[PDB]
Amino acid sequence: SSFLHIGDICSLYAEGSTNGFISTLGLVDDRCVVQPEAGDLNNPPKKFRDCLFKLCPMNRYSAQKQFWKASTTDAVLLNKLHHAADLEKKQNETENRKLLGTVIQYGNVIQLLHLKSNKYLTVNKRLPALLEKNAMRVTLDEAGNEGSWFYIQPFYKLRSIGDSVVIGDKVVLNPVNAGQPLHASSHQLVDNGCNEVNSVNCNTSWKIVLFMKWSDNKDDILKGGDVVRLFHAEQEKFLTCDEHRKKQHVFLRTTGRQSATSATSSKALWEVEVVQHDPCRWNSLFRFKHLATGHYLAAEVMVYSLVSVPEGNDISSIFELDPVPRNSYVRLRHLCTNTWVHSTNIPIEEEKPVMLKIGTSPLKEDKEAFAIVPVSPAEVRDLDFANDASKVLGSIAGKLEKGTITQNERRSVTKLLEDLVYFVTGGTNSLEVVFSKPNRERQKLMREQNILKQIFKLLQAPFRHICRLCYRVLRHSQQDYRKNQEYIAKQFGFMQKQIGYDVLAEDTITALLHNNRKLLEKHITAAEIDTFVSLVRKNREPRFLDYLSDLCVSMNKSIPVTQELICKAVLNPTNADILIETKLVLSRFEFEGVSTGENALEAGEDEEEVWLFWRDSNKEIRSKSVRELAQDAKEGQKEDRDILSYYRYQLNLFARMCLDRQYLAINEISGQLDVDLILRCMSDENLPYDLRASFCRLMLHMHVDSKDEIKERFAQTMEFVEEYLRDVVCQRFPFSDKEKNKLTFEVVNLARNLIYFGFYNFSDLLRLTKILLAILDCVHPEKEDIMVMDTKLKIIEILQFILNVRLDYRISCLLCIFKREFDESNSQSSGALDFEHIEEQAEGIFGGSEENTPLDLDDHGGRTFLRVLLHLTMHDYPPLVSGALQLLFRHFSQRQEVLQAFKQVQLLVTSQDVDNYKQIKQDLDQLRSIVEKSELWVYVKEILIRLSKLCVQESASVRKSRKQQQRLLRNMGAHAVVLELLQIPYEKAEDTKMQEIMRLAHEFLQNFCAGNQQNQALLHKHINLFLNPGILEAVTMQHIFMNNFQLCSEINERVVQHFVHCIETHGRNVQYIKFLQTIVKAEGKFIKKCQDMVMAELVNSGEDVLVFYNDRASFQTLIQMMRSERDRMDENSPLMYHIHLVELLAVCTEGKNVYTEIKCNSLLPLDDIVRVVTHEDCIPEVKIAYINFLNHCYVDTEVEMKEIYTSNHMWKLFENFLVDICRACNNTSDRKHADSILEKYVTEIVMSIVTTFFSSP
């Protein structure tokens, strides 16, 4: 008849005194029960996916059971016992696939495996059970042990061991050694009508009810119960179910990612109900149970439309497929109705929604094609092992808001809020952790499955394992996850009281502090002078107060900050003593050196605490260099010191330079300096990884060959460094290298910059180099990538002093050494008064030392030195020009005082553009903040007129400065954000700005329509410009029409035609007949210039991507209607600026008849031009005699054309034997001396013109 097999999926139905279908209580609770009333044979359980199992051969638990004795100090013996538990664990997978399908046979030793929870049924021999007192504890263990082997055997003696098992047979399962047979209890659990199954010799009879037979070739085939998402072929959109307006709606969901297929949520997942007849396992129909709610899908009231139905029974919840295979791309058909599905664009209150309704149509299409994207089974068990969590905190957060919870529930919830930690980090944290790194897909599975929501509706009403243990879960799921962080605001202020009962809420606000930088710092504020004083007066160890200290990041933190320091001098009530002033401290040290406990222990705390925050002082040095008195560092330790001298140094000497030099020399060198400069540039610049820099490290170890007070610490250094060279003679950077290579670390780099701030141009700084050579040479997988982040930085401090020296300090003398003669008498080396401008420019560095509190020396003395700059702006670029930029950098803080500009204004006085603006993009991300703040207030004035000047500068330069804008970081953000504020504002003539800082960026090699390929995407997303009745603000029009030209004006795609046609389209021309003289006259006293620029804007449509403008059939869709309308604008005068609208309309007028061949059917356009070119006054023809001679040759080539365009063009043959005969210009201007090339290119352009005419039309 019909047999059971290894592979079949069935159900087992208990037939003793309590009946049922076994089932779990979720992926949280590892128990097993019989829901007697949850279903019967005749009426199957409604969740008959959690009462399903797979029949497994016998598994191997000896080397894995050996591996569950982690009785060993040894580490090589542990990695051994594992490689045997994992080889075993894969020998199981191997052997289990061959045996796939066998007639099982009675008295085989099978185990049983849960599909939905993917854990093995297992008898825990050495336990009692929970609801029953004798029976062993039957649990669901994920990987199994010997306690999951089950002897299957026939209950009745109808069949008997040694025949092959039939389907249905009642059987008893009997573990191989764990003792007694499985048995469905009589004992309702506590919480749930759920009888707890356990092991105890009993007369229960297990029927075996098949579900799928062992033919489900997957993920190979779509068979009933596979979880899939349903992607859209045309629309490129997944199929989802949610609620809008408190109503369940299905829809297609829109994504803003830049990779459609990277939009995965746990709500587009649909269970497949391969409809059968009884509840079991491409020509038959299908139903989609929405994988999240439990509501199927069904199309009800395009004749019909899709929405969720609570029960998937109604014939409506049945469909039919059209091209089975896993990952098929199908078209589907709603059965009851006979219609084929279709996606609209009317959505369901929001501003810019996302939910696009989906409906049906009796018309079968070809593009509405969906993709049966199969879901990974783990992800399905992820959504599983979270929903549980949502409903666990749904009982417990419900039972503790209105009253009390037992001692069994605390133990299981606390447990829960440890497991989730064990989830969200992709199995890394938990306890005594080593690492703690997040896993993204789970975090999204929390805000979307209201784990988070549950959490905040739990805290709100001992707790020592509830809060802030939640609050560390919250510290894991918002990690580097913006969208989930835009939630802790109202929550952030639990961190306070949750910071009490435990400093765990501390963890969060610093996970805050850093990223939530800038904007975290404004809400604490003086709050802090009451949460360290508190955190000091309650957190006796004061952890809170400390990692607070460790949280300070960004210049703007120093303020509010320094305030608490003062509380500290009123708060030094630590009830202990420290003094000597060299002895009893020192003695202190000989004593905590003792690794003894309690006392010695303590020292670590105030030691770190001093190092970090006391050095904390960076360039607030003054506050730092005033708070850090006596300079001591004999015993230096962990880097504390290196930091402190930073604190003091800032007070003294912002070092700067300029780059040593300039001119052709630096080259002759570097070239002389050959690759070298390159080999090391890659390793540090790149080779963040060890290996790559390692190679340039071989390329090294072959080679072959008045400071006074700032000095008196420097020497103790060089000795110590040699030390690093004497410890260096010691290869091992083992344990030592934690201490040494930290203290070091804090040394290595701060020394890079200490040689860039304290060398000397005599044989000393260098000869010290010499000794450093022998220093730097004295020093040259596994847990060493967590350590090798730190190694990576060390090699930076290395190659860092190394390059600040070796690159830019290095080689400075051989230079001035080589002075001799060259031609003019032996002259060996042993802009006018360059001095005066470099000692007003030193009046400058002294400028660079001063500050705003200095009201006396602030305004009166310095003044606008800018005049010197403005006056020497024409003269050649000094070398201490990067030392100029010294001054520049400082003003990046702020500018309220009107004063800035006049001084700031000297800088504008510049005449070595290219080279600088290379150094000026230094601020590109800041100065992008200068256009985004300068832009939220423009369209104190020095930051928008200065971020614009900076812009026309990185705008009137190289084609490479153009590509360098490289403004994915951030164009689309300076056009979308400068617009955003800057569209709705527009400034009237004459002073008005939106047009020069969005009009010096698109200087695309000073015409024509090219190299602006970036201008289809940033011009892609934007808000448009006004239209129809009314009017708007002036200038930023003139600006706009032009600006559009250069964004969608490139010549290369077919867009450009629909682009200078999408929007204004043909329709624009109409409104350009009358009324913009009116918006320019309400626009500004000079009405007719914003109008006349409105006229170079409407006449230049042919000029930019004309060629392209035509693109596809652009001269066929407005043929006829633009030429006649043009006669409507055929007359004008007094046009110097509008005659740049008559050379931007003689370029505009040149782009009417350069491309046509069977489209022209109008008359008379030819006399009118001739008339307009004769009616001229003002400027020497030569530009209107190369635009009208340029007209006279572009006309004179055609020939038989015009000979259809009008009756004759005979006034046009005298007129080009004039704009071409001319005079010395036309009388006596005599301004051109490349005549022979004039007459030449004009007589090989009169020879190219001669070849043409023969082919006229």
In contact, 792 and 688? CB cutoff 8 Å:
yes
Spatial neighbors of 774 by CB under 8 A, at least 6 apart, are 722, 725
What is the smallest separation between the CB atom of 238 and ligand I3P, expressed in angstroms?
9
Peptide bond into 990 cis (omega under 30): yes
Closer CB to ligand I3P, residue 477 or residue 1216? 477
What is the smallest separation between the CB atom of 56 and ligand I3P, expressed in angstroms?
37
What is the smallest separation between the CB atom of 354 and ligand I3P, expressed in angstroms?
8
Written as one letter, the residue type at 105 is Q
Closer CB to ligand I3P, residue 256 or residue 781? 256
Closer CB to ligand I3P, residue 971 or residue 1216? 971
Spatial neighbors of 1000 by CB under 8 A, at least 6 apart, are 948, 951, 952, 953, 955, 956
What is the smallest separation between the CB atom of 485 and ligand I3P, expressed in angstroms?
9
Q: Is 255 annotated as a binding residue?
A: yes
Q: Please, what sign has the CA dihedral across residues 271, 276, 280, 282? A: negative
What is the smallest separation between the CB atom of 332 and ligand I3P, expressed in angstroms?
24
Q: Is 627 annotated as a binding residue?
A: no
In contact, 898 and 940? CB cutoff 8 Å:
yes
Q: Is 717 annotated as a binding residue?
A: no
Closer CB to ligand I3P, residue 257 or residue 703? 257
Give the HSE-up count for residue 754: Cα atoms under 13 Å, Cβ half-sphere: 24
Closer CB to ligand I3P, residue 444 or residue 656? 444
What is the smallest separation between the CB atom of 260 and ligand I3P, expressed in angstroms?
9
What is the smallest separation between the CB atom of 1022 and ligand I3P, expressed in angstroms?
18
- Dihedral angle at the C-alpha atoms of 838, 839, 843, 847, nearest 10 degrees? 30
Closer CB to ligand I3P, residue 345 or residue 1028? 345
3-class DSSP assignment, residue 53: strand
3-class DSSP assignment, residue 227: strand
φ, ψ of residue 551 to 5 degrees: the values are -85, -15
**Distance, CA of 970 to CA of 966 (rounded, Å):** 8
DSSP letter at 261? Answer: G
DSSP letter at 1051? Answer: S
Closer CB to ligand I3P, residue 263 or residue 687? 263
3-state secondary structure 268-293: CCEEEEECCCCCCCCCCCEEEEECCC
The per-residue DSSP string of 624-648 comes to HHHHS-S---SS-TTTHHHHHHHHH
Nearest Cα neighbor of 1096 from 1148, 1061, 1027, 1047 is 1148
Closer CB to ligand I3P, residue 19 or residue 443? 443
Extended strands (E) in 953-1008 = none
What is the smallest separation between the CB atom of 867 and ligand I3P, expressed in angstroms?
49
Q: Is 20 annotated as a binding residue?
A: no
Nearest Cα neighbor of 1067 from 1024, 1140, 1125 is 1125
Closer CB to ligand I3P, residue 237 or residue 1002? 237
Spatial neighbors of 1047 by CB under 8 A, at least 6 apart, are 1002, 1012, 1015, 1016, 1018, 1019
Spatial neighbors of 981 by CB under 8 A, at least 6 apart, are 935, 936, 937, 939
* Residue number with the smallest Cβ distance to ligand I3P: 256
Nearest Cα neighbor of 756 from 815, 810, 680 is 810
Residue 894 tokens, joined = 């702020």
What is the smallest separation between the CB atom of 246 and ligand I3P, expressed in angstroms?
22
Q: Is 604 annotated as a binding residue?
A: no
Render the burial of 156-194: b for 16+ CB within 10 Å, e for the rest: eeebeeeeebbbebbbbbbbeebbbbbbbbebebeeeeb
What is the smallest separation between the CB atom of 947 and ligand I3P, expressed in angstroms?
26
Render the burial of 401-416: b for 16+ CB within 10 Å, e for the rest: eeeeeeeebeeebeeb
Q: Is 1203 annotated as a binding residue?
A: no
Spatial neighbors of 598 by CB under 8 A, at least 6 apart, are none
3-class DSSP assignment, residue 1190: helix
In contact, 548 and 532? CB cutoff 8 Å:
yes
What is the smallest separation between the CB atom of 265 and ligand I3P, expressed in angstroms?
7
Closer CB to ligand I3P, residue 162 or residue 256? 256
Q: Is 437 annotated as a binding residue?
A: no
What is the smallest separation between the CB atom of 261 and ligand I3P, expressed in angstroms?
11
What is the smallest separation between the CB atom of 478 and ligand I3P, expressed in angstroms?
12
Roughly how many angstroms between the first and final C-alpha of the chain, as a whole number? 91
Closer CB to ligand I3P, residue 265 or residue 1043? 265
Closer CB to ligand I3P, residue 482 or residue 960? 482
What is the smallest separation between the CB atom of 254 and ligand I3P, expressed in angstroms?
7
Catalog residues that contact ligand I3P under the rule CB under 6 A.
255-257, 263, 444, 482-483
Length of the chain: 1257
Closer CB to ligand I3P, residue 257 or residue 1233? 257
Q: Is 1231 annotated as a binding residue?
A: no
Closer CB to ligand I3P, residue 963 or residue 1021? 1021
Q: Is 281 annotated as a binding residue?
A: no
Residues at the binding site for 1D-myo-inositol 1,4,5-trisphosphate are: 253, 255-257, 444, 447, 481-482
Binding-site residue numbers are: 253, 255-257, 444, 447, 481-482, 661, 932, 935
Which residues line the annotated binding site for Ca(2+)?
Answer: 661, 932, 935
